[PDB]
Write a protein that binds this ligand. Structure first.
Ligand SMILES: OC[C@H]1O[C@@](CO)(O[C@H]2O[C@H](CO)[C@@H](O)[C@H](O)[C@H]2O)[C@@H](O)[C@@H]1O
Ligand SMILES: OC[C@H]1O[C@@](CO)(O[C@H]2O[C@H](CO)[C@@H](O)[C@H](O)[C@H]2O)[C@@H](O)[C@@H]1O
Ligand SMILES: OC[C@H]1O[C@@](CO)(O[C@H]2O[C@H](CO)[C@@H](O)[C@H](O)[C@H]2O)[C@@H](O)[C@@H]1O
Ligand SMILES: *S(O)(O)Oc1ccc(OCc2ccc(NC(C)=O)cc2)cc1
Length: 468
């Protein structure tokens, strides 16, 4: 028997629900799907729906009942979704679909994407104080998976991530950022799976690698949790003890791998942490050298930004942690992947579903110690026909990096699908995510975005649920 939800988590939850119950109710975001074999007919159906929605009978029908009725139609090759809070927004969106015009809350394509989605599991720099809290309180599938990870992390490290999520007075550090984002990644992905979705492949970046291993069927949930827990506390404890000459900084610079090779001849202790994008690289090393490369970049009109850490992951500074990381991971059981993996640990190379296991102890050591070939993984995915990249995160930081690589590789219309974001309603964000999966033809049962009807008022008087 794993540990249950702590008394403190329950106390915090109760206070959070009381705060929620006293807030003004916001209109939900409802997905309205239309489709046909031909785009011309799709546009006609959008126009007919808009005209009906303008009528007195249409105006008296809830958006939810309209959306539910639309979800039970046949879903053709040419698809569109209008995301709306009220009838005016719905009608404007539908008019744009009918006219072939773009609009912020409208997705419309002539046919399905050819290859399945790549799930992107990153995390660094995505965290914020209240991440995951709103969705935890309002979505029971998400909540159940958060609690499952919370129990496992309690067992491994002896504290509750759910307490961190629910207590607005608490914020995240090097350790707790990692385990909490991992929990959110697991819960987001399983929420998606609950609605019929699945990755065709995964790609990880540094803390995200552990979640990527789980979704690729390479480790059980328990063993993926061991992978993130081990690196998280070692990193956090190691970094807190660094002072003076032991400090190693990390910084994003606008230099490519090829530029780095030349630039580094002047800085003998700098190392590459992350190849993030074609012209963006995260570097690490002694403060004086990091400051000098930043100064060189600014003098050449290139972007450069220092991260808030006294330690550099993915450098030789990790060497003293590796023996303990080894000991703590003894007994994990790497399994044969059930989807593709672009391994940014193994220089961005692809591993097919059903291939040999990769996620052994040496994998986690190499992962922590050596560079992250992120841009290389994305490029390999683009070169093998992938166009949809879906990021599981509290904020879509990595998607910006993906967009740079996709554009550089000649793909100018990638489907870049975020999940959560700070300052965005978390329930609405997930509606949008799943609507996009539907529009592009990826696995997703749009019927499950609506609760089961309990009466005729839960349908609208349109096909296929006209009242006789
Ligand atoms: O939740 C808002 C409201 O609750 C109080 C208690 O009435 O504090 C609870 O919520 C805080 C935010 O998560 C916690 O830090 C605190 O521990 C908890 O008691 C109020 O102080 C707050 O305004
Ligand atoms: O080790 C000398 C060698 O490294 C340089 C490179 O800029 O400096 C670094 O090494 C020093 C230790 O000897 C540190 O004090 C310093 O922080 C670090 O950048 C030069 O001193 C020389 O070429
Ligand atoms: O075209 C089938 C294809 O569409 C998806 C969504 O992209 O599912 C839709 O079509 C199903 C009927 O074929 C419905 O059951 C479902 O509700 C709807 O989303 C994919 O999941 C499916 O492979
Ligand atoms: S691992 O354990 O997560 O260590 C690590 C530190 C830093 C990394 O940088 C990738 C990155 C992240 C964010 C941004 N942009 C922001 C914060 O705005 C650029 C590059 C990766 C791994």
């Amino acid at each position: 028997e794993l540990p249950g939800v702590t008394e403190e988590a329950l106390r915090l939850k109760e206070a959070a629900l009381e705060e929620l119950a006293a807030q003004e109710v916001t209109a939900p975001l409802v997905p309205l799907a239309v489709s046909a074999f031909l785009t011309s007919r799709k546009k006609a159906a959008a126009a007919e729906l808009a005209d009906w929605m303008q009528s007195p009978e249409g105006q008296a029908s809830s958006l939810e009942s309209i959306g539910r009725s639309l979800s039970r139609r046949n879903h053709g090759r040419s698809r569109a979704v209008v995301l709306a809070h009220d009838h005016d927004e719905a009608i404007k969106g539908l008019r744009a679909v009918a006219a072939g015009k773009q609009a912020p809350n409208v997705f419309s394509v002539d046919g399905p994407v050819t290859t399945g989605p790549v799930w992107v599991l990153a995390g660094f720099g995505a965290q914020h104080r209240k991440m995951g809290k709103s969705l935890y309180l309002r979505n029971e599938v998400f909540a159940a998976w958060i609690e499952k990870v919370d129990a496992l992390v309690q067992d491994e490290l002896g504290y509750s991530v759910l307490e961190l999520i629910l207590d607005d007075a608490q914020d995240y550090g090097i350790e707790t950022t990692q385990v909490t984002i991992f929990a959110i990644q697991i819960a987001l992905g399983e929420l998606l799976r609950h609605h019929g979705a699945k990755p065709a492949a995964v790609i990880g970046q540094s803390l995200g690698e552990a979640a990527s291993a789980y979704f690729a069927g390479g480790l059980s949930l328990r063993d993926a949790t061991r992978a993130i827990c081990s690196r998280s506390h070692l990193m956090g404890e190691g970094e807190a003890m660094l002072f003076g000459e032991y400090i190693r900084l990390m910084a994003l610079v606008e230099y490519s791998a090829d530029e780095i090779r030349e630039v580094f001849s002047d800085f003998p202790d700098l190392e590459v942490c992350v190849y993030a994008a074609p012209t963006q690289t995260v570097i690490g090393g002694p403060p004086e050298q990091v400051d000098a490369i930043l100064a060189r970049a600014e003098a050449e009109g290139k972007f450069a930004r220092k991260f808030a850490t006294k330690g550099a992951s993915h450098t030789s500074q990790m060497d003293p942690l590796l023996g303990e990381l080894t000991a703590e991971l003894q007994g994990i059981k790497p399994t044969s992947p059930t989807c593709g993996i672009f391994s940014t640990v193994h220089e961005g190379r692809y591993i097919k579903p059903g291939g040999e296991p990769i996620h052994d102890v040496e994998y986690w050591k190499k992962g922590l110690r050596h560079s992250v070939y992120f841009t290389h993984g994305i490029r390999n995915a683009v070169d093998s026909g992938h166009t949809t990249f879906l990021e599981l995160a509290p904020n879509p930081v990595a998607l910006m990096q993906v967009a740079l690589t996709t554009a550089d590789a000649g793909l100018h219309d990638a489907q870049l699908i975020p999940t959560l974001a700070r300052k965005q309603d978390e329930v609405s964000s997930m509606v949008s995510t799943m609507a996009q999966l539907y529009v592009y033809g990826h696995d997703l049962d749009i019927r499950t975005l609506f609760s089961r009807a309990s009466g005729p008022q839960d349908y609208a008087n349109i096909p296929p649920t006209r009242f006789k």
